[PDB]
Amino acid sequence: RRALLVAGKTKINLQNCHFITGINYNGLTVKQLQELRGILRENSNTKLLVAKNTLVFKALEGTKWESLKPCMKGMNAWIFVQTEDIPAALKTFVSFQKEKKLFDNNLGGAVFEKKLYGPQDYKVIETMPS
Amino acid sequence: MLKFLSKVKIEFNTLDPRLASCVEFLAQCNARKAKESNPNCQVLVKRRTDDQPPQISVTFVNGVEEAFDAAATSAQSIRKMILDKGQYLETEQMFREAGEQWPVIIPEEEIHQEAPGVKPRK
Amino acid sequence: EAKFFRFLKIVGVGYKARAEEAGRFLYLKLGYSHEVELAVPPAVRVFCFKNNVVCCTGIDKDRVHQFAATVRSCKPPEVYKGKGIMYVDEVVKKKVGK
Amino acid sequence: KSTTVVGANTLKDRSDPKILPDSDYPDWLWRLLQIRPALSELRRKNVETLPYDDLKRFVKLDTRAKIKENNSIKAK
Amino acid sequence: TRRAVAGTIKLTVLAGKASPGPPVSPALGPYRLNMMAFCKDFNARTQKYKPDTPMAVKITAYMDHSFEFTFKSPSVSWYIKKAAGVDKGSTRPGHLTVTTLSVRHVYEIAKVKQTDPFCQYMPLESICKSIIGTANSMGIKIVQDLE
């Protein structure tokens, strides 16, 4: 029944999703975590969701978001970008690391147009605008 | 956790499906409890694009370096043998600091010698 | 080669520990009129350091652990001030002496 | 007696605000008093044909019920 | 920054009148905490408001005798028993109703209770239902409109 929640939450999360990534949420306080979730929802259009690794992928199986399966280890927060404006969605977390000084919490792996880009790779996609 | 170590250098390819031990070790050693036991320690992360296997290579306080097979062993196993080797190096230390020769050595035939029970006497 | 180690702590004013002959004999001062002498068994050796700390080494785990238990049983820790012989990592829970 | 909110505003320049007419108010404000579904209703329904918010309320209420049950059996 | 938090104490002081002895006495004297800089920084903050506002402060005590405290606007209990009626809650709440309030005072307090430093992303419906919960805790009755 608690998996039905995660199935529904990611079903609503993937209705307009263009981009899935992860954030290592080691050491983040509850106030910091809620602040990042709120920053991502008004300055951008992206919904953040902490869930099991095994549930999210099972709701990403037989789907467009199918090959992410290796990058589903560790304490992860899933950042379903439901807009098209990927550059602002990636810039606001860079602003978050710069302002709040949290360099242990990084963006690990992403899926865009069914391609798993490394964090080396989806940085020029933050550099380019529209 | 960090009371025998002076550098935790962890490197892994980000995409490879055996990153679980490395990222879990990063979870263990970057904790609030861990860095209040050794603020002088260094935790180094090297994210790389090539396909070397994940490798946790720690070095201890007395310069001893002992690498690990990160792609094949869990982070709790890494932590357990780090605790064992660090305790052994600490035992060897106050041994050398007090004038005792290290390692302490005994002949390997006193096991077959009979040992009567130790009765404390005046 | 001695693989197994167990470390004892001596707590108390005037309490002392002293090894004599290459680790084959241990002598304790536990507030009595005499010293308490323990003959260290074969494949076990004993050392004393500058923290009032006893060390028990050897190649047999059973004999080393048992000898450390014997040394602790010479003067087990008392509950009111923590004096006596205890393991280094042992936690003693005190109570209020009225 | 029902024209201003008493002591709401605390700024020294400002004063207590006034109750606006029912056009400046949001639509949810007169839906606050409704009876949200309870745990007895949701436990006797079908879980798969529940809405999303009804499922969310069901899981939080079941977690609260079981946590209070644990506290009750573990209490003394 | 790096300090292991020694303690965290909450504290109630009326607005601007922080003379450190009756409320700011043993409360900060128990944990070695300094009084002068805390009081000057507090009264340098709650000067914009009317005096005698029972404002609540959470002090994050430390080991280097340093302060990073957060000042919070007063409780919704005071906001509801000042904007509704008597200053005495029920003896048996939910059995003995004391004062009744409709929805609009609740809406205005929810507008006030969003201005806290850590509630920027909380929505007003959430705070409104929370205020109905606090009202039900006190015996205060809630209605649609009083006439």
mmCIF file of C-alpha atoms in Angstrom, chain A residues 27-92:
data_model
loop_
_atom_site.group_PDB
_atom_site.id
_atom_site.type_symbol
_atom_site.label_atom_id
_atom_site.label_comp_id
_atom_site.label_asym_id
_atom_site.label_seq_id
_atom_site.Cartn_x
_atom_site.Cartn_y
_atom_site.Cartn_z
ATOM 1 C CA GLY A 27 23.707 15.129 6.064
ATOM 2 C CA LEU A 28 20.925 17.465 4.967
ATOM 3 C CA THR A 29 18.758 18.713 7.798
ATOM 4 C CA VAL A 30 14.979 18.627 7.528
ATOM 5 C CA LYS A 31 14.859 22.422 7.258
ATOM 6 C CA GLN A 32 17.499 22.369 4.495
ATOM 7 C CA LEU A 33 15.674 19.553 2.689
ATOM 8 C CA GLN A 34 12.294 21.299 2.806
ATOM 9 C CA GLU A 35 13.971 24.536 1.710
ATOM 10 C CA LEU A 36 15.505 22.842 -1.337
ATOM 11 C CA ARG A 37 12.170 21.188 -2.183
ATOM 12 C CA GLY A 38 10.453 24.575 -1.944
ATOM 13 C CA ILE A 39 13.124 26.344 -4.004
ATOM 14 C CA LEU A 40 12.753 23.726 -6.749
ATOM 15 C CA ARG A 41 8.957 24.135 -6.880
ATOM 16 C CA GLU A 42 8.526 27.908 -7.263
ATOM 17 C CA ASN A 43 11.754 29.130 -8.868
ATOM 18 C CA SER A 44 11.526 26.094 -11.173
ATOM 19 C CA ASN A 45 8.762 23.596 -11.960
ATOM 20 C CA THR A 46 10.460 20.463 -10.627
ATOM 21 C CA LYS A 47 9.075 18.096 -8.021
ATOM 22 C CA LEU A 48 11.463 16.412 -5.582
ATOM 23 C CA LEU A 49 10.605 13.010 -4.123
ATOM 24 C CA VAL A 50 12.451 10.780 -1.677
ATOM 25 C CA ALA A 51 11.521 7.169 -2.288
ATOM 26 C CA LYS A 52 12.842 3.656 -2.357
ATOM 27 C CA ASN A 53 15.223 2.834 -5.164
ATOM 28 C CA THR A 54 13.312 -0.375 -5.903
ATOM 29 C CA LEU A 55 9.945 1.351 -6.231
ATOM 30 C CA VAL A 56 10.858 4.268 -8.405
ATOM 31 C CA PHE A 57 12.425 1.848 -10.914
ATOM 32 C CA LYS A 58 9.515 -0.427 -11.331
ATOM 33 C CA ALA A 59 7.607 2.663 -12.196
ATOM 34 C CA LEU A 60 10.189 3.492 -14.670
ATOM 35 C CA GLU A 61 10.359 0.006 -16.044
ATOM 36 C CA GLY A 62 9.047 -0.764 -19.526
ATOM 37 C CA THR A 63 8.996 3.018 -19.881
ATOM 38 C CA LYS A 64 10.933 5.767 -21.600
ATOM 39 C CA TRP A 65 12.979 6.126 -18.401
ATOM 40 C CA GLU A 66 14.225 2.575 -18.587
ATOM 41 C CA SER A 67 18.016 2.500 -18.591
ATOM 42 C CA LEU A 68 18.565 4.581 -15.398
ATOM 43 C CA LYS A 69 18.728 1.305 -13.422
ATOM 44 C CA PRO A 70 22.518 1.427 -12.647
ATOM 45 C CA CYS A 71 22.264 4.891 -11.049
ATOM 46 C CA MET A 72 19.846 3.793 -8.308
ATOM 47 C CA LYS A 73 22.127 3.206 -5.318
ATOM 48 C CA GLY A 74 22.687 5.316 -2.222
ATOM 49 C CA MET A 75 20.510 7.780 -0.329
ATOM 50 C CA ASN A 76 18.695 9.369 -3.249
ATOM 51 C CA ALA A 77 16.216 12.165 -3.821
ATOM 52 C CA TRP A 78 14.569 12.017 -7.245
ATOM 53 C CA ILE A 79 14.233 15.333 -9.084
ATOM 54 C CA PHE A 80 11.494 14.966 -11.696
ATOM 55 C CA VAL A 81 11.834 18.087 -13.830
ATOM 56 C CA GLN A 82 8.294 18.478 -15.181
ATOM 57 C CA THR A 83 9.123 21.514 -17.329
ATOM 58 C CA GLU A 84 11.274 22.035 -20.393
ATOM 59 C CA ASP A 85 13.537 24.641 -18.748
ATOM 60 C CA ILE A 86 16.318 22.276 -17.680
ATOM 61 C CA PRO A 87 18.940 25.162 -17.493
ATOM 62 C CA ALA A 88 17.149 27.045 -14.696
ATOM 63 C CA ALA A 89 16.409 23.764 -12.900
ATOM 64 C CA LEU A 90 20.111 22.937 -12.870
ATOM 65 C CA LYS A 91 21.198 26.502 -12.086
ATOM 66 C CA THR A 92 19.046 26.772 -8.960
#
